[PDB]
Amino acid sequence: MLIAIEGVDGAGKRTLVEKLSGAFRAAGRSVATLAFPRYGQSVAADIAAEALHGEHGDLASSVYAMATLFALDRAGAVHTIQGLCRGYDVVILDRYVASNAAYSAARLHENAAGKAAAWVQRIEFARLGLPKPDWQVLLAVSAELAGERSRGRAQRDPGRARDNYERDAELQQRTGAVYAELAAQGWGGRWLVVGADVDPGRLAATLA
Amino acid sequence: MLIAIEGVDGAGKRTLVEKLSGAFRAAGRSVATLAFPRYGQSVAADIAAEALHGEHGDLASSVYAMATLFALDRAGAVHTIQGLCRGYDVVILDRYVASNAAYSAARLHENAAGKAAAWVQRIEFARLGLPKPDWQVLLAVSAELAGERSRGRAQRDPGRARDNYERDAELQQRTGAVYAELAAQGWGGRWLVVGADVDPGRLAATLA
Numbered sequence: 001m002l003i004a005i006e007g008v009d010g011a012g013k014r015t016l017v018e019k020l021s022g023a024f025r026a027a028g029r030s031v032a033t034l035a036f037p038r039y040g041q042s043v044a045a046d047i048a049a050e051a052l053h054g055e056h057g058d059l060a061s062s063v064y065a066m067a068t069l070f071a072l073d074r075a076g077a078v079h080t081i082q083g084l085c086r087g088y089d090v091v092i093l094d095r096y097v098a099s100n101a102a103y104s105a106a107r108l109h110e111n112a113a114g115k116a117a118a119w120v121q122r123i124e125f126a127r128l129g130l131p132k133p134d135w136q137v138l139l140a141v142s143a144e145l146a147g148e149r150s151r152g153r154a155q156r157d158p159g160r161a162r163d164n165y166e167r168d169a170e171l172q173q174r175t176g177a178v179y180a181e182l183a184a185q186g187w188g189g190r191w192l193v194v195g196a197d198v199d200p201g202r203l204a205a206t207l208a
Numbered sequence: 209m210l211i212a213i214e215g216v217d218g219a220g221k222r223t224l225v226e227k228l229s230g231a232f233r234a235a236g237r238s239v240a241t242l243a244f245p246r247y248g249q250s251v252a253a254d255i256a257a258e259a260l261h262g263e264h265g266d267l268a269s270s271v272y273a274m275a276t277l278f279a280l281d282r283a284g285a286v287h288t289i290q291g292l293c294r295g296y297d298v299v300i301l302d303r304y305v306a307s308n309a310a311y312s313a314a315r316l317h318e319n320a321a322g323k324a325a326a327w328v329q330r331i332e333f334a335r336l337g338l339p340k341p342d343w344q345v346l347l348a349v350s351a352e353l354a355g356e357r358s359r360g361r362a363q364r365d366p367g368r369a370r371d372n373y374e375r376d377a378e379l380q381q382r383t384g385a386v387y388a389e390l391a392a393q394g395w396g397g398r399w400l401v402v403g404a405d406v407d408p409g410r411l412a413a414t415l416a
């Protein structure tokens with residue numbers, strides 16, 4: 001089973017992955033986790049991050065260029081994902097294809113039924129062959145709280161200055177809204193919308 | 209030995225590669241040829257071409273985004289290039305790293321000593337590890353003649369409509385000028401500037 005944890009930056013995704021992993025292992029399931037972007041491992045991922053921090057000229061100014069880099073990173077992980085699904089009972093991804101749909105649509109002020117979301121569908125799932133997840137869990141949080149976390153993280157870690165998207169409060173707001181639409185639409189597969197207070201044990205039971 | 213044939217679109221590069229290959233083989237050297245972009249083989253290359261034909265939203269509007277796609281295509285060919293150099297006496301490339309420097313600088317109205325050219329140097333040769341060619345042959349041609357060839361090709365082949373750059377006559381002009389500067393500068397290695405009338409036998413002798 002392939003599960004993707006989605007949400008805006010600062011939503012608490014990494015923490016949910018950790019808690020969920022423990023819940024699954026408690027239930028006797030083998031668990032593997034993979035996070036996107038695959039920084040260090042993927043040049044596309046690194047260039048994208050660098051672009052979001054002021055490098056590489058006009059690269060970040062293009063919505064589709066950024067989406068393409070994140071898609072190329074995932075395309076290079078297809079073998080990894082297939083291998084993990086063959087080796088473990090549960091594979092949990094911290095961010096996946098839906099991240100591209102949410103942020104891309106938001107940057108263009110489009111909704112989940114828009115052009116960008118459809119483009120991501122055609123490119124990543126169909127053309128690049130990324131498998132559709134069995135579950136996509138939206139960790140919904142208020143834009144204000146998520147933002148406060150992204151800022152706090154930058155104040156405590158010098159190698160963690162916020163990226164261009166995180167410095168755009170309205171973009172974060174719109175991204176959260178597109179995520180809610182994607183979930184209601186069942187974009188790319190079935191979704192579950194949860195909060196930071198969700199019970200790992202029950203969530204794992206629902207997913208397994 | 210690694211030789212790259214450079215020049216604007218419609219300059220006559222493919223023809224020179226063919227004639228040069230024959231000249232080298234006549235001299236008893238084994239020859240291999242590789243062309244960039246690696247259409248079909250590289251997703252980055254295909255997406256880039258598609259973007260230059262009106263697809264993928266605002267992707268082509270970013271100079272660095274386009275340069276990145278062409279660089280990622282080449283990065284995926286490093287193994288191929290090293291293998292060819294180990295297996296043949298001469299390896300001839302139809303377009304290489306300099307193509308990115310020339311077109312990128314031109315789109316930004318910069319010269320060979322500019323930011324874009326330097327960025328290409330840092331990314332492709334240093335960061336991505338692409339080997340610097342032993343020779344870079346600039347097939348210089350008048351912008352008018354090159355353009356007439358690109359147009360004529362589109363009139364005869366339906367699957368060959370001109371790309372966005374080819375539809376920009378001034379851009380082609382500026383690209384030719386940046387190429388001349390790159391050659392005079394010895395950018396990325398030594399260059400040779402030749403015309404369509406160059407003698408394959410002598411050119412091959414010079415390169416070998």
Ligand SMILES: Nc1ncnc2c1ncn2[C@@H]1O[C@H](COP(=O)(O)OP(=O)(O)OP(=O)(O)O)[C@@H](O)[C@H]1O
Pocket residue numbers: 033034035038041079080083084
């Ligand atoms: N970014 C990553 N996050 C988590 N696990 C990863 C990541 N990249 C690779 N792995 C895991 O580490 C082990 C793999 O890597 P290696 O990188 O050694 O694989 P390969 O030798 O390229 O094998 P394969 O094609 O199966 O991935 C695999 O079992 C894979 O599931």
Ligand SMILES: Nc1ncnc2c1ncn2[C@@H]1O[C@H](COP(=O)(O)OP(=O)(O)OP(=O)(O)O)[C@@H](O)[C@H]1O
Pocket residue numbers: 241242243246249287288291292
């Ligand atoms: N786009 C290309 N143009 C010309 N020759 C190519 C191209 N792609 C691969 N080749 C050549 O075709 C043969 C290779 O390909 P294959 O694609 O079968 O290689 P591999 O099995 O991936 O081997 P290697 O790592 O050596 O490339 C090689 O000898 C290589 O030099």
Ligand SMILES: Cc1cn([C@H]2C[C@H](O)[C@@H](COP(=O)(O)O)O2)c(=O)[nH]c1=O
Pocket residue numbers: 009036037052067070071095096097099100103104163165166
């Ligand atoms: C994985 C992914 C991240 N992003 C965004 C989220 C951030 O603003 C940034 C990097 O992600 P990260 O904060 O999870 O490391 O890029 C996308 O736009 N598309 C994607 O596919």
Ligand SMILES: Cc1cn([C@H]2C[C@H](O)[C@@H](COP(=O)(O)O)O2)c(=O)[nH]c1=O
Pocket residue numbers: 217244245260275278279303304305307308311312371373374
């Ligand atoms: C290989 C390469 C081509 N190009 C340009 C030349 C064209 O306008 C187009 C495709 O190249 P092509 O006409 O040789 O198939 O992109 C670059 O800008 N950078 C590159 O690295």
